[PDB]
Scaffold this active site. Structure first.
Site, short mmCIF file in Angstrom:
data_model
loop_
_atom_site.label_atom_id
_atom_site.label_comp_id
_atom_site.label_asym_id
_atom_site.label_seq_id
_atom_site.Cartn_x
_atom_site.Cartn_y
_atom_site.Cartn_z
CG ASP A 22 -0.30 -0.06 2.54
OD1 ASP A 22 0.95 -0.12 2.63
OD2 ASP A 22 -1.03 -0.03 3.55
CD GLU A 41 1.49 -8.96 1.75
OE1 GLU A 41 2.28 -8.00 1.64
OE2 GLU A 41 1.69 -9.93 2.52
CG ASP A 42 -3.73 -3.19 1.99
OD1 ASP A 42 -4.96 -3.31 2.17
OD2 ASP A 42 -2.90 -3.20 2.93
CB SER A 43 -1.90 -5.40 -4.74
OG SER A 43 -0.54 -5.23 -4.37
#
Ligand SMILES: [Mg+2]
Ligand SMILES: [Zn+2]
Ligand SMILES: [Zn+2]
Ligand SMILES: [Zn+2]
Lengths: 57, 67, 45, 263, 49, 113, 84
Positions: free
Chosen positions: A34, E1-3
RNA sequence: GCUUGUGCUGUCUUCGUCCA
C-alpha cells in the site's frame, strides 16, 4: 529490527517500475503493498557475492 | 471537465448524448427516465452521464489569451 | 525577431533585447512568449 | 453440427443463441470480437493551432476515441507492413478539422461531424466518422469562445484493441449459459432460501426448469450459449461476428502453417 | 496485501488520467554598478563552464 | 518509463520463432510446445478440442506470467499416434466448425433481415 | 610458539558455514584471476560453481588458520575438514 | 577544411510517506 529484514534474493529483470516479491517473504520484512518502499544493494566482488549467496540467502 | 467520449467500463459511446440529456432534463423528465430515454441500460454507462460535472463552462469564462 | 503577447489586451508585438519589458499599447508589465513554429505531433492515446 | 439461432437483429446489436459448440469456442469467439477484430481509428494528430481551454493531448485522446467507418478496413494494410515512404493512401486515412468562433458573444461547439475526409484508399468505404442519422451532430469534441480556434490534421490507421482500446469494435458482449443452474457450476449464496433470493435470468423461459424429483446429471455439459454483441457503429454486428470467426480461422491456419513448415 | 487490479481498457479510455504542471523561475541578479546577469543563448566560445 | 510497447503483445520479432517443439522424455510420446505472441484465446480452444480425442491421453497449458505474451502446452498421445498429428487434426477440426458456424449465421441473418 | 601441533588439535573437524563461505569466495576470486583449476570442468564457466565443484571433491588448495582467544592458532587443511 | 563542449552550494524551518 532483526536479521531477517535483510536477505539475499536473485534478480529477475522485469518491466514496470516496482520491485516484485513473493508474498511469503512479506512477513519477515513486515511489508505490504500500500505504498511501502524497499532498498536494494549490489555486491561488487566475487567474495562478497559468495557471502551473500551462502549466508544471507 | 467535458463529457467523456466512451464509458470507462465498457466503451459505449456516451459523448453524443450530453445535450439530449440536458434537453430532456429541461422538459421536466426525471434523471432516471431521461437516462432510460437515451437507451443507457447498464449502470456503468448511467454513472458516466449521471455523475459528470461540466467544468469547461467555468474555464470558458476567462478571457482568451490570444487574439 | 521574437513575438510576444500582452497579458491584458492580448496584443502582439516584437522586442529586440533592448526595449523595456512592457506592452506597447496598454502598458502592462506582464507579457508572454508566442507558440513555436516547429511541428507538433501527438499519438492520440 | 453447430447451430445458430438469432433472436433480435439490428445494425448495432444482435442477440443470438449458439448451440452444439464447446464453451471454449464461444468464449474464444467473445474474446476475438472484443480484442482482435481490426478497425480504423485516428492515431496521429498534427496540431497547427490550438487556442482553446483544452490541452493538446486532451484533444488528441478525445480524437483517438471517435469511431470511424471501418467496413473496408480488410483491404487496407498495416502501417508497419506498408513499404511506402511516410503515410500513403493504402495504409492511412487523413482527416482535417478546422473550427473557429465568429462574433464576440456566445460559445461554439465542435462536433465530430466537422471532421472532413481529405484522402484515403480509392473507392473503399473507410474513414468517415460514424453518424447515427443525417441530422445527427455526433460526439462533442471541444467548446470555443471568441478568438479561439482549433486547426488539426489527423491520420487514421488500422489496428486492434490489444494495442489500444480505441480500436475495439464492440462495447460490451453479454454472455450467459445454463439459466436454471442444472450443471451446478455456481453455488448460490443465501440467507434463508436460495431460490427466492436470486432473480431469474432473462433466458429462464427458454429452458425447462428441472423437475423436483430429478437427480443430478453428471454426464451433461454446457450446450446452449446466449450472447448479445453491441457495436460502437464502426462495424455492423453481423460484420463483427463474421470477422471474429474469420480472425479465429486465420490464427488457426497460421498455427497449422507453422506446424507443417516446422518439418 | 492491499494491491488492486485495474482495467487496462478503462485506463485506455481515460480512467484516472491526469495533467501535471511544473513551473521554473529565474531572474537577473545585480552584483555591482555595471555587473548584471543577462538572459541569452550561451556560446562555447564566449562563455565558460 | 519502464512500460513495454503495446504492440509487443502480438508482433513477432524476427529472431523469435512462433513455435518451438521439444520432447518430454519423462513419459513416452509427449512433446512440449511453446507458443509465442499468443494467449488464452487460442490455448483454451486447442486444449478443449484436443481433450475430446480418444487417442489424446494428456493435454494442458499454462501462462507462466501475465506480463509476457506466451503460453506453453504439454501434449501426450497414444503409441500409434504422434502428438503433432493430433494438434494438426485439432486445428483442422476447429477451422471446419468455424466455417459451418459462419455459413449458418449468414443463412439465418439473410433469412431474418 | 603460537602454532599448535597437529596431534593435539582440539577444534571441531567440520567446516563451519563462515569458513565455507569465505573459502568459496576466495577460491572463486582466484579462479576468476586465472589460477589453475585442480578439477576437470565439463562445461562449467562460473567461477563460484567451479569452486563449489572443487570443494565437493576436496581439491581446494587452501589452509584455514583458526584463532583461539589467547592468541594461539591451529592450521587445518581444506581437504581434511568434513564438508556437508 | 571542417570538427562537441564536460558540473554543484550550505544552514534552518515547515509539510508529508511507510513502520511503530
Ligand atoms: Mg504499508
Ligand atoms: Zn458502460
Ligand atoms: Zn497590452
Ligand atoms: Zn503506405
Amino acid at each position: 529490527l532483526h536479521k531477517m529484514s535483510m536477505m539475499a534474493h536473485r534478480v529477475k529483470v522485469m518491466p514496470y517500475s516496482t520491485f516484485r516479491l513473493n508474498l511469503s517473504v512479506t512477513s519477515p520484512y513486515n511489508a505490504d503493498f500500500d505504498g511501502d518502499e524497499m532498498n536494494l544493494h549490489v555486491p561488487q566482488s566475487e567474495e562478497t557475492r559468495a557471502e551473500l549467496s551462502q549466508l544471507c540467502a | 471537465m467535458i463529457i467523456p467520449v466512451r464509458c470507462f467500463s465498457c466503451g459505449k459511446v456516451v459523448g453524443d448524448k450530453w445535450d439530449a440529456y440536458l434537453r430532456l432534463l429541461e422538459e421536466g423528465k426525471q434523471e432516471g427516465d431521461a437516462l432510460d430515454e437515451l437507451k443507457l441500460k447498464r449502470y456503468c454507462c448511467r454513472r458516466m452521464v449521471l455523475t459528470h460535472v461540466d467544468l469547461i463552462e467555468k474555464f470558458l469564462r476567462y478571457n482568451p489569451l490570444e487574439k | 525577431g521574437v513575438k510576444y503577447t500582452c497579458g491584458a489586451c492580448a496584443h502582439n508585438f516584437s522586442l529586440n533585447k533592448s526595449d523595456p519589458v512592457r506592452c506597447k499599447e496598454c502598458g502592462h508589465r506582464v507579457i508572454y512568449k508566442a507558440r513555436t513554429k516547429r511541428m507538433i505531433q501527438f499519438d492520440a492515446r | 453440427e453447430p447451430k445458430v439461432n438469432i433472436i433480435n437483429a439490428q445494425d448495432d446489436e444482435v442477440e443470438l443463441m449458439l448451440s452444439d459448440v464447446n464453451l471454449s469456442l464461444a468464449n474464444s469467439l467473445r474474446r476475438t470480437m472484443l480484442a482482435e477484430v481490426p478497425t480504423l481509428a485516428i492515431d496521429l494528430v498534427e496540431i497547427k493551432m490550438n487556442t482553446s481551454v483544452l490541452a493538446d493531448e486532451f484533444i488528441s485522446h478525445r480524437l483517438g476515441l471517435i469511431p470511424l467507418v471501418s467496413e473496408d478496413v480488410e483491404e487496407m494494410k498495416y502501417s508497419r507492413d506498408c513499404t511506402c515512404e511516410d503515410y500513403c493512401d493504402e495504409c492511412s486515412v487523413v482527416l482535417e478539422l478546422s473550427a473557429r468562433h465568429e462574433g464576440e458573444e456566445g460559445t461554439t461547439d465542435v462536433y465530430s461531424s466537422s471532421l472532413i475526409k481529405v484522402s484515403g484508399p480509392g473507392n473503399l468505404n473507410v474513414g468517415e466518422p460514424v453518424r447515427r442519422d443525417d441530422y445527427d451532430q455526433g460526439i462533442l469534441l471541444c467548446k470555443l469562445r471568441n478568438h479561439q480556434e482549433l486547426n488539426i490534421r489527423c491520420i487514421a490507421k488500422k489496428g486492434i484493441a490489444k494495442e489500444h482500446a480505441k480500436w475495439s469494435p464492440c462495447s460490451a458482449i453479454a454472455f450467459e449459459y445454463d439459466p436454471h443452474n442444472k450443471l451446478k457450476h455456481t453455488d448460490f449464496w443465501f440467507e434463508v432460501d436460495a431460490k427466492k433470493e436470486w432473480p431469474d435470468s432473462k433466458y429462464a423461459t427458454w429452458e425447462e426448469p428441472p423437475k423436483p424429483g430429478e437427480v443430478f446429471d453428471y454426464k451433461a455439459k454446457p450446450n446452449r450459449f446466449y450472447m448479445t454483441v453491441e457495436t460502437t457503429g464502426s462495424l455492423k454486428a453481423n460484420q463483427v461476428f463474421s470477422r471474429g470467426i474469420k480472425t479465429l480461422q486465420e490464427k488457426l491456419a497460421n498455427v497449422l502453417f507453422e506446424l507443417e513448415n516446422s518439418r | 496485501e492491499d494491491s488492486m487490479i485495474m482495467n487496462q481498457s478503462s485506463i485506455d479510455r481515460g480512467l484516472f488520467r491526469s495533467l501535471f504542471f511544473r513551473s521554473y523561475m529565474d531572474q537577473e541578479k545585480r552584483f555591482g554598478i555595471s555587473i548584471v546577469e543577462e538572459f541569452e543563448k550561451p556560446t562555447r566560445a564566449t562563455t565558460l563552464r | 518509463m519502464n512500460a513495454p510497447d503495446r504492440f509487443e503483445l502480438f508482433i513477432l520479432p524476427d529472431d523469435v520463432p512462433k513455435l518451438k517443439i521439444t520432447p518430454d522424455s519423462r513419459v513416452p510420446n509427449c512433446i512440449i510446445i511453446k507458443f509465442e505472441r499468443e494467449d488464452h484465446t487460442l490455448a483454451n480452444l486447442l486444449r478443449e478440442e484436443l481433450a475430446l480425442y480418444p487417442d489424446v491421453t494428456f493435454v494442458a497449458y499454462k501462462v507462466e506470467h501475465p506480463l509476457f505474451a506466451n503460453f506453453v502446452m504439454r501434449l501426450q498421445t497414444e503409441e500409434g499416434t504422434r502428438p503433432k498429428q493430433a494438434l494438426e487434426r485439432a486445428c483442422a477440426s476447429i477451422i471446419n466448425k468455424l466455417k459451418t458456424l459462419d455459413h449458418k449465421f449468414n443463412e439465418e441473418w439473410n433469412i431474418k433481415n | 610458539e603460537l602454532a599448535i601441533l597437529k596431534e593435539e588439535r582440539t577444534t571441531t573437524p567440520y567446516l563451519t558455514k563462515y569458513e565455507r563461505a569465505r573459502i568459496l569466495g576466495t577460491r572463486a576470486l582466484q579462479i576468476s584471476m586465472n589460477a589453475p583449476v585442480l578439477v576437470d570442468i565439463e562445461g562449467e564457466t562460473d567461477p563460484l560453481q567451479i569452486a563449489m565443484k572443487e570443494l565437493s571433491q576436496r581439491k581446494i588448495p587452501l589452509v584455514i588458520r583458526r584463532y583461539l582467544p589467547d592468541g594461539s592458532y591451529e592450521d587445518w587443511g581444506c581437504d581434511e575438514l568434513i564438508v556437508d
